[PDB]
Amino acid sequence: PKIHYRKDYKPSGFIINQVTLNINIHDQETIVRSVLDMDISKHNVGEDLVFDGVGLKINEISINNKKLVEGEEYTYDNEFLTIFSKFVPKSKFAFSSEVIIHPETNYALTGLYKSKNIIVSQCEATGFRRITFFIDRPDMMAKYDVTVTADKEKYPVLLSNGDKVNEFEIPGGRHGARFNDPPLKPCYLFAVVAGDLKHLSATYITKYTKKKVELYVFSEEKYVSKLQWALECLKKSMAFDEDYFGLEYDLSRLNLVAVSDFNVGAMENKGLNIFNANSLLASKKNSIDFSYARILTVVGHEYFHQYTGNRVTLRDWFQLTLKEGLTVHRENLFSEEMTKTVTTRLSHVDLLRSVQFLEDSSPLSHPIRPESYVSMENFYTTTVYDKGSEVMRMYLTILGEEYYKKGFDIYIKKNDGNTATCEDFNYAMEQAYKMKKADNSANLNQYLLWFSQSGTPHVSFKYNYDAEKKQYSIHVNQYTKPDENQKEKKPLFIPISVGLINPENGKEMISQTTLELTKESDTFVFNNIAVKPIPSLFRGFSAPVYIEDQLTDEERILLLKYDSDAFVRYNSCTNIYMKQILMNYNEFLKAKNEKLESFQLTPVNAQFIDAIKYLLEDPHADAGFKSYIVSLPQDRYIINFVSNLDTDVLADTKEYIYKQIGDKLNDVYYKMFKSLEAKADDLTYFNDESHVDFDQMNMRTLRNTLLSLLSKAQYPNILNEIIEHSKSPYPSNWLTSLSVSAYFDKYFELYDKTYKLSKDDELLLQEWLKTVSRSDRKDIYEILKKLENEVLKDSKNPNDIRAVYLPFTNNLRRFHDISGKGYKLIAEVITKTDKFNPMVATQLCEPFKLWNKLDTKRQELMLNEMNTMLQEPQISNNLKEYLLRLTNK
Numbered sequence: 058p059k060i061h062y063r064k065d066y067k068p069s070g071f072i073i074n075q076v077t078l079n080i081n082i083h084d085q086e087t088i089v090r091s092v093l094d095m096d097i098s099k100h101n102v103g104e105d106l107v108f109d110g111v112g113l114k115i116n117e118i119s120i121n122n123k124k125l126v127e128g129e130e131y132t133y134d135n136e137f138l139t140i141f142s143k144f145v146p147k148s149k150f151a152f153s154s155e156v157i158i159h160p161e162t163n164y165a166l167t168g169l170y171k172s173k174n175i176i177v178s179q180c181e182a183t184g185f186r187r188i189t190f191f192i193d194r195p196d197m198m199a200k201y202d203v204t205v206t207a208d209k210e211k212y213p214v215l216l217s218n219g220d221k222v223n224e225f226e227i228p229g230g231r232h233g234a235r236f237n238d239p240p241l242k243p244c245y246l247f248a249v250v251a252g253d254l255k256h257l258s259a260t261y262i263t264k265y266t267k268k269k270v271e272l273y274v275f276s277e278e279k280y281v282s283k284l285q286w287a288l289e290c291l292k293k294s295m296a297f298d299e300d301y302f303g304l305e306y307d308l309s310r311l312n313l314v315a316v317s318d319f320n321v322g323a324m325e326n327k328g329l330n331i332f333n334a335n336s337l338l339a340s341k342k343n344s345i346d347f348s349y350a351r352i353l354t355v356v357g358h359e360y361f362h363q364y365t366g367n368r369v370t371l372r373d374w375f376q377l378t379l380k381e382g383l384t385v386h387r388e389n390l391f392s393e394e395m396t397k398t399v400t401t402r403l404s405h406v407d408l409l410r411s412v413q414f415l416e417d418s419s420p421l422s423h424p425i426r427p428e429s430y431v432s433m434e435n436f437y438t439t440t441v442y443d444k445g446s447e448v449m450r451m452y453l454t455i456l457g458e459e460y461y462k463k464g465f466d467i468y469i470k471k472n473d474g475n476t477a478t479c480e481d482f483n484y485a486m487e488q489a490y491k492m493k494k495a496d497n498s499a500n501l502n503q504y505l506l507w508f509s510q511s512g513t514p515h516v517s518f519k520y521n522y523d524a525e526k527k528q529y530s531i532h533v534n535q536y537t538k539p540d541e542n543q544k545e546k547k548p549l550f551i552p553i554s555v556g557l558i559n560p561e562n563g564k565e566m567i568s569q570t571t572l573e574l575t576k577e578s579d580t581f582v583f584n585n586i587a588v589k590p591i592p593s594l595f596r597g598f599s600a601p602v603y604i605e606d607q608l609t610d611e612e613r614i615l616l617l618k619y620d621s622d623a624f625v626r627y628n629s630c631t632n633i634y635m636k637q638i639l640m641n642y643n644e645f646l647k648a649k650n651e652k653l654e655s656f657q658l659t660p661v662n663a664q665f666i667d668a669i670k671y672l673l674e675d676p677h678a679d680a681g682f683k684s685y686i687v688s689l690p691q692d693r694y695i696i697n698f699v700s701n702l703d704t705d706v707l708a709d710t711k712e713y714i715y716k717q718i719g720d721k722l723n724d725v726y727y728k729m730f731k732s733l734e735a736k737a738d739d740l741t742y743f744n745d746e747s748h749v750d751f752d753q754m755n756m757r758t759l760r761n762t763l764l765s766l767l768s769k770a771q772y773p774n775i776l777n778e779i780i781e782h783s784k785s786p787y788p789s790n791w792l793t794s795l796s797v798s799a800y801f802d803k804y805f806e807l808y809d810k811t812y813k814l815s816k817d818d819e820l821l822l823q824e825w826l827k828t829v830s831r832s833d834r835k836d837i838y839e840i841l842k843k844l845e846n847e848v849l850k851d852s853k854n855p856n857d858i859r860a861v862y863l864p865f866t867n868n869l870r871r872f873h874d875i876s877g878k879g880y881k882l883i884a885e886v887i888t889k890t891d892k893f894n895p896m897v898a899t900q901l902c903e904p905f906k907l908w909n910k911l912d913t914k915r916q917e918l919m920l921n922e923m924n925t926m927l928q929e930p931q932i933s934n935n936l937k938e939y940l941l942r943l944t945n946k
């Protein structure tokens with residue numbers, strides 16, 4: 058198994074200047090003819106000409122129109138085509154080939170494949186070589202001239218990159234289209250689509266040069282009514298890159314296409330963005346609320362790639378975070394501007410500190426720019442993407458908006474049309490840094506450690522206040538735990554956005570201030586501080602770190618009530634919860650270990666419960682923020698703080714804490730649940746797909762969160778509310794009615810009701826599956842078996858498989874059943890899936906990522922299932938590599 062090392066990058070000895078493709082689609086085969094106009098580079102040392110080509114059936118290959126003979130002049134081993142140097146020309150030459158591929162049986166959804174009745178490609182990262190021979194790496198930039206032919210009745214819509222320059226009829230009911238794309242691109246941005254597509258379209262006029270851009274959004278005919286929000290999001294995206302970054306679109310046309318079968322969310326193929334249907338299609342009748350932010354972010358994300366990925370592209374795959382981290386950052390700026398709700402930023406922090414922190418403390422831990430890889434399909438991680446985004450966002454925190462924009466524009470102007478590396482970006486940011494600090498001596502060399510060093514830093518604090526001197530000190534320390542990537546961790550450049558709150562009146566005591574911590578520790582002193590403050594630390598979550606604020610719960614409560622920063626308020630609440638959770642966990646653990654007949658639990662802080670009531674009852678407070686404060690921290694966030702975590706003991710801890718708070722606040726919950734109804738469920742704009750109200754959706758989030766808390770608690774007659782809720786027109790509401798009914802004898806009645814509502818929309822049925830999957834049911838194993846037999850069957854649709862199984866894996870009490878049966882079940886599904894889609898099989902491994910964090914029995918149970926998977930004769934390269942790394946082999 059070949060391991061690629063970042064330090065080993067060398068340019069190719071060859072050049073590919075022009076690609077000319079003919080893709081002839083038939084029912085039982087697709088014939089691909091390719092002419093590559095090639096040259097010898099300055100790096101050439103007379104080596105063999107080696108192409109990537111995977112699973113290709115050779116009809117013929119030729120050099121300069123002379124047929125090549127297998128054995129004597131070339132060998133093919135189903136992975137590499139080797140042409141021995143003596144037969145390779147020494148100047149400009151043409152290589153051509155004709156191969157047969159089979160998209161119809163291509164269930165791995167990489168290269169060219171059939172999704173329902175759409176033919177579609179996915180070439181990132183190294184899928185182009187599954188379509189035809191190539192030197193399949195992003196620094197091999199070429200021009201593309203692509204002709205697609207197909208049966209006209211089945212595939213009336215033909216798309217590829219660039220301009221459609223010809224359309225023509227073909228004998229036998231076929232029909233062709235030629236696309237010429239003169240600008241250079243890497244092959245992973247190639248795409249082709251064929252199908253009976255229906256569309257919505259609009260014309261966009263760019264801000265500055267007033268270019269007319271045609272916008273098309275496509276789906277299968279059945280779901281053409283679900284395309285409108287995507288189109289609006291695209292317009293929004295274009296406007297944002299114009300307004301914030303001063304960047305306009307450069308092509309005449311942009312196509313977005315939804316397909317039912319897709320490994321991930323979407324792909325940024327130049328002029329032809331291809332989407333998982335669940336990340337493009339929605340309507341208010343047939344989608345839950347979450348779809349609207351999802352489509353906004355994914356449409357935005359692929360649009361922002363047009364600059365950060367497509368126009369400035371990657372030298373090599375080790376630079377992945379340079380396009381992914383930066384594009385997620387651009388997408389997050391966009392989404393925060395469009396939603397105007399503080400929960401948007403909170404939700405990204407929530408995701409980072411739960412999923413990515415777990416990854417960063419697991420045996421899979423890697424820096425955002427790794428030093429090596431075996432499987433590229435395993436490289437697309439929350440670390441590379443979301444920690445990557447936070448590292449890109451820190452530049453903005455450090456520079457401030459004006460100098461950030463200057464630096465970003467330096468980066469684009471300098472590297473537009475070329476490949477780039479993480480260093481090129483840091484260099485651009487550094488120029489701005491020099492300007493901001495006003496001396497050419499300032500530099501960001503230390504900042505590069507954010508790209509190379511793995512692990513989450515820990516930042517802790519001590520405070521001192523001299524009342525007579527009016528002098529306040531914040532002493533700060535940073536620490537990263539050694540891991541397999543660095544024995545010795547170095548101090549990072551950590552920007553700490555801070556405020557100082559006067560606890561007597563809640564006012565700000567200093568102006569906007571960002572502490573630049575560049576050492577292992579430092580002491581920051583503030584003069585003319587009139588009274589002892591409460592520090593508001595890492596406002597906006599200003600660095601991706603473990604914050605150890607060393608504040609009392611009294612101080613945290615004061616911040617939660619009166620601080621100006623949504624993240625610090627939410628974090629203060631989070632920290633109060635975590636202290637409570639750790640304390641009760643240990644009390645429950647000791648009672649278990651010592652087999653106590655009786656014991657005491659520390660109650661939840663009453664002043665904390667009082668503050669929650671206060672915020673909940675404040676008519677001016679944010680609905681989304683409210684739903685965060687009544688929710689305990691995610692299980693995967695909690696596990697970062699506990700060794701040998703016993704999941705049962707944690708389930709008992711959560712239970713006690715929720716019951717403590719509900720025993721005091723349920724009447725408040727109920728009252729709010731009722732009074733929120735009118736605005737939350739307002740139907741005024743239900744038939745206007747262009748009208749999306751994120752505040753109103755947050756109000757429904759709060760109601761559905763409250764209803765969940767009231768149902769678990771068996772609040773008097775809450776079942777009445779549940780039943781009425783099931784009649785709501787909003788799927789967020791009537792699907793919530795299914796999951797909260799788990800605690801009642803009406804569960805299977807709502808099961809059937811909601812199934813009948815969901816079954817005729819592919820995506821809605823997937824949301825139904827998720828709802829069932831995450832239901833808090835004692836008979837959840839029997840229910841999963843029912844889904845398998847009645848609904849899922851032998852679907853190879855990744856959306857179906859992920860919907861049935863992943864939410865169940867977050868069932869703390871049941872997935873982690875001490876028999877190991879949940880581990881057994883998921884491993885069976887992974888092995889089954891790995892036979893046809895190794896990438897999705899590896900995604901289904903996610904629950905095992907925390908295996909060495911659990912109590913020793915469950916470690917052993919998980920490890921056994923992983924070793925059983927590893928011993929499957931037919932295990933994919935993807936899955937083997939992943940489990941080998943995960944189990945420290």
Ligand SMILES: CC(C)(C)C(=O)N[C@@H](C(=O)NO)c1ccc(-c2cc(F)c(F)c(F)c2)cc1
Nearest residue numbers: 167179181182320321322323324325433434437
């Ligand atoms: C949901 C997110 C936004 C994280 C997503 O869909 N990411 C894709 C992306 O960044 N789009 O711009 C994405 C796209 C392709 C791949 C990808 C990588 C491979 F190696 C494959 F084989 C493949 F099929 C897809 C992974 C993630």
Ligand SMILES: [Mg+2]
Nearest residue numbers: 317819852854
């Ligand atoms: Mg289907």
Ligand SMILES: [Zn+2]
Nearest residue numbers: 358362381384
């Ligand atoms: Zn991306």
